[PDB]
């Protein structure tokens, strides 16, 4: 039919979407800033639609409950028609690509290790061969699923430890996992996406480090309900923005230019 | 209808598709080896189709002639229905994504600089600020198009030089550009994709080097004619292979394990 204001689902995750400090003075899309706030503005311009940013109610990326088969998070908001598009650091996975459409990826990432500086760990293999330092992942996301499914020996060894560890090694939010690394005196390491890991390393108090190579190679995509009319224009817009240098400019804006830990 | 043997278009490009040395003893798909030979076998298995590898007649990736609007290369083979699928290091671009379907990317790359070891160049900026050392790209591909379209100052400066340079800085095949770097005593630098650059650096005579960071961020996709029934199963297969670790294993097989220049 006639063009309608598009409901965008997204998630509070630095530096993608962040509440402006004075947000209670502000209304609508003006409450928020970040890489995905900027990317939403670009996508909507290039597709000629009006839109409203909404933070996912349950604060989750998206996983399907094994008993109910109900999708939660941003994936769930698309699946049940509560949002028209998800513009967020939402990982392209086979289990999701089957229930939602994903654009070509707008950013690459791989799973990585965050340590408190000085922690005697340089790799996933190192983590797996010891017990002094606990380690975990975010709940309700692609990292946790990577470990759960992995048939690779070292990651399977890691998963077997993590699923049964006490107290729990899993966290609800990235901020929580970061707080735990910062406050555990080197006795907790966090497995999170390289992109997030990199942003945090350049933020005060400058007490974390990314170590080792990435565990996998993947991407974030703009997601739409399966068969949405938005899917095609959205994908073309991501490719156009890539080719125009805009994605690179936005990455520099929200990563390099936001660096607080020196050169 | 009933399932038919799929015609695969591909291109002789190391280490993706390479003639086996004894190929005149061999027939059909057995003539060829490489990353994309292996990837084709995996894709066809996961999609349950039989297939025939064919080398693109004109030896080109795909560009559209500005006067005729006729597509050449592997893109042209898809557009005119001479091939059912292209399984090759074929770059996802907006001009192509509009005439063919691309899978989610199976490998990432960026444009990069190849020099003869000892060449006093470390970046694109360095190349642009001098004239002693000539530099160019492959014809009929995404690298040449990147420079031609770029609105970025340094790349526009590079393009202005390259388009008018004499003798021509452009080459028909990657092997030709590599030969020119090797035989020009440091007076020619070649702009090519990081993936290819990396493979060549680890091959005898070990006389080239990749320098500087990548100029862009993009990917190779499996391409199909627009609206092909193969598009969906092919994409799911790429995601499944990614998640299974197969793409990483194949990268190690054809890059790291093929290294001839030491550690
Ligand atoms: C035209 C650009 C917008 S594009 O689409 O290339 N995307 C732009 C860039 C940043 C990108 C490239 C490849 C990937 N990627 C995803 C996967 C797995 O899905 C893999 C691999 F190869 F490691 F398996 N790479 C993710 C992101
Ligand atoms: N980007 C991930 C969330 C972060 C993580 O799982 O580490 C997802 O889409 O589920
Ligand atoms: N992968 C490129 C060819 C190599 C290049 O242009 O450097 C393409 O699809 O056109």
Which of B97, B235, B242 lies nearest to residue A236, judging by beta carbons?
B97
Q: Which residues in chain A are closer than 8 Å to B97, comparing Cβ atoms?
A: 104, 235-236, 239
Ligand 2 atom at minimum distance from A137 CA: 7
CA angle A126, A129, A130 (to 5 degrees): 95
CA-to-CA distance for A195 and A108, rounded, in angstroms? 8
Residue A263 lies in a domain: no
Only one residue has tokens 């760990």, namely A121
DSSP-assigned letter for residue B29: G
Q: Tell which residue, A59, A46, A69, has the closest CA to residue A173.
A: A59
Using alpha carbons only, what angle is made at residue B12 by residues B11 and B14, rounded to the nearest 5 degrees?
120
* Domain annotation covers residue A43: yes
Q: Where are the alpha helices (DSSP H) in chain A?
A: 35-47, 73-79, 94-97, 124-128, 142-149, 153-164, 174-183, 194-201, 231-243, 246-254
Q: Is residue A104 part of a domain?
A: yes
For residue B161, the SS3 value is helix
Q: Which atom of ligand 2 approaches the CA of A91 most closely? A: 9
- DSSP code for A18: E
Residue A4, token pair as written in the block: 């309608």
Half-sphere exposure of B252 (CA within 13 A, CB side): 5
Q: Is residue B149 part of a domain?
A: yes
Give the integer Cα–Cα distance in Å for B37 and A135.
39
DSSP notation for A53-87:
EEE-TT-----B-TTT--B-HHHHHHHTTS-SEE-
Residue B194, H or E segment: helix B194-201
- Mutation choice for ligand 2 from A14, A35, A174, A193, CB with most ligand atoms inside 8 A: A193
Across the interface, of B94, B236, B247, the residue whose CB is closest to A97 is B236
| Residue B107 CA, ligand 1 centroid: distance in Å | 7
Do A48 and A132 have their domain in common?
no
Residues A188 and A145 in one domain: yes
CA B118 to chain centre: 26
Q: Does one domain contain both A125 and A187?
A: yes
A97 and A224 housed in the same domain: yes
A chain contacts of residue B156, beta-carbon cutoff 8 Å: none
Give the whole-angstrom CA distance, residue A256 versus residue B144: 29
Q: What CA–CA distance (Å, rounded) separates A64 from A59?
A: 15
Q: How far is it, in rounded angstroms, from Cα A201 to Cα B248?
A: 27
Euclidean distance between CA atoms B178 and B132, whole angstroms: 18
CATH code (residue A233): 3.40.190.10
Atom of ligand 3 nearest to the CA of B62: 10
Q: Assess if residue A63 is contained within a domain.
A: yes
Retrieve residue B176's tokens: 């030709």
Compute the distance between CA of residue B211 and CA of residue B13 in angstroms, rounded to an integer.
21
Structural domain containing residue B45: 4-109+219-258
What are B220's strand-pairing partners? Answer: B91, B107
What is the spatial distance between Cα B142 and Cα A61, in angstroms, rounded to a whole number?
Answer: 34
Asked whether residue A124 is domain-assigned, the answer is: yes
- Whether B239 sits inside 8 A of A92 (CB atoms) is yes
Q: What is the DSSP string of B116-138?
A: ETT-S--SHHHHHT-SSSEEEEB
How far is it, in rounded angstroms, from Cα A254 to Cα A203? 11
Same domain, B66 and B151: no
Same domain for A39 and A168?
A: no
Nearest Cα to A238, choosing from A128, A90, A110?
Answer: A90
Q: Are residues B8 and B94 in the same domain?
A: yes
Distance of CA B106 to the CA centre of its chain: 12
- Calculate how close chain B gets to A201, using CA atoms only, in Å: 21
Tell whether A140 and A203 lie within a shared domain.
Answer: yes
Which tokens is B178 given?
Answer: 């590599």
Contact between B137 and B174 under an 8 Å Cβ cutoff? The reply is no
How far is Cα B147 from Cα B124, in angstroms, rounded to an integer? 12
**Resolution in Å, one decimal place:** 1.8
Q: Is B219 on the interface with A (CB under 8 A)?
A: yes
Residue B33 CA, distance from chain mean position? 16
The span from the CA of A11 to the CA of B127, in Å, is 42
- What token pair was written down for B110? 């960026």
Residue B51 to residues A84, B106, B196, B242: CA-CA distances in angstroms? 39, 20, 26, 22
Spatial separation of the C-alpha atoms in residues B21 and B26, rounded to whole Å: 10
Specify whether B105 is located in the same domain as B115.
no
Number of separate domains in chain B: 2
Instruction: Give one word for B26, left, alpha or beta, with left for phi > 0 and alpha for psi -120 to 50.
Output: beta
Method: X-ray
Question: What CA–CA distances, in Å, run from A182 to A130, A158, A185, B99?
Answer: 20, 21, 7, 50
Same domain, A99 and A62: yes
In angstroms, the CA A67 to CA A3 distance is 38
- Record the tokens describing residue A240, joined without a space: 């156009």
**Quick one: which ligand is closest to A237's CA?**
1
In this structure, is residue A120 part of a structural domain?
A: yes
Q: For chain A, give me the number of helices (H) and strands (E)?
A: 10, 13
Task: Tell me whether residues A242 and B217 touch, CB distance under 8 A.
Answer: yes
Cβ distance A35 to A16 under 8 Å? yes
Q: Distance from CA of residue B157 to its chain's centroid? A: 24
**C-alpha torsion sign, points A136, A139, A141, A146:** positive
**Greatest Cα-to-Cα distance within chain A, rounded to the nearest angstrom:** 60
Q: Is the CB of B219 under 6 A from ligand 1?
A: yes
Task: Map tokens 């224009």 to a residue.
Answer: A233
User: How many helical (H) and strand (E) elements, i.e. helices and strands, does chain B have?
Assistant: 10, 13
Which residues in chain A (139-168) have CB-CB distances under 8 A to chain B?
149, 151-152
Task: Confirm if B16 and B90 have CB atoms less than 8 A apart.
Answer: no
Count Cβ atoms within 10 A of the Cβ of residue B163 and give its class: 0-12 exposed, 13-18 middle, 19 or more buried: middle
Which tokens is B249 given? Answer: 């294993």
Where do we find the tokens 């028909």? B172
Task: Give kind and range of the element (H or E) at residue B111.
Answer: strand B111-116
DSSP-assigned beta bridge partners for residue A134: A188
Distance (Å) of CA A205 to CA A180, A195, B104: 14, 18, 38
Whether residues B92 and B117 fall in one domain: no
Same structural domain, B114 and B156: yes
Q: Is residue B263 part of a domain?
A: no
One-character DSSP codes across B246-261: HHHHHHHHHTGGG--S
- Token code pair at residue B133: 């050392």
- In the three-class reduction of DSSP (H, G, I as helix; E, B as strand; rest coil), residue B58 is classed as coil
Cα-Cα-Cα-Cα torsion A94, A96, A100, A104, nearest 10 degrees, comes to -50
CA–CA distances in Å: residue B179 to residues B111, B133, B169: 19, 15, 13
Element (H, E) at B232: helix B231-243
User: Ligand 2: distance of its center to the CA of A151 in Å?
Assistant: 20
The residues, any chain, with a CB within 8 Å of residue B233's CB and separated by 6 or more, are B46, B47
């Amino acid at each position: 039919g006639a063009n309608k204001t598009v409901v965008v689902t997204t998630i509070l995750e630095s530096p993608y979407v962040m509440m402006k400090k004075n947000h209670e003075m502000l209304e609508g899309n003006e409450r928020y800033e970040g890489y995905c706030v900027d990317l939403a503005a670009e996508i909507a311009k290039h597709c000629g639609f009006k839109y409203k940013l909404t933070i996912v109610g349950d604060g989750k990326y998206g996983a399907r409950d094994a008993d109910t088969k109900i999708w939660n998070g941003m994936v769930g908001e698309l699946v049940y028609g509560k949002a028209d598009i998800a513009i967020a650091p939402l990982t392209i996975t086979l289990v999701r690509e089957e229930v939602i459409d994903f654009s070509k990826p707008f950013m690459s990432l791989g799973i990585s290790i965050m340590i408190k500086k000085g922690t005697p760990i340089e790799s996933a293999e190192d983590l797996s061969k010891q017990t002094e330092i606990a380690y975990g992942t975010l709940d309700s996301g692609s990292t946790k699923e990577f470990f759960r499914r992995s048939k690779i020996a070292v990651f399977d060894k890691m998963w077997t430890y993590m699923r049964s560890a006490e107290p729990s090694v899993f966290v609800r939010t990235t901020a929580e996992g970061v707080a735990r690394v910062r406050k555990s005196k080197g006795k907790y390491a966090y497995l999170l996406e390289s992109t997030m890991n990199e942003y945090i390393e350049q933020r005060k108090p400058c007490d974390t480090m990314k170590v080792g190579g990435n565990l996998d190679s993947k991407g974030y995509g703009i997601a739409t309900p399966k068969g949405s009319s938005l899917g095609t224009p959205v994908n073309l817009a991501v490719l156009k923005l890539s080719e125009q240098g805009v994605l690179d400019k936005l990455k520099n804006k929200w990563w390099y230019d936001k660096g607080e830990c020196g050169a």
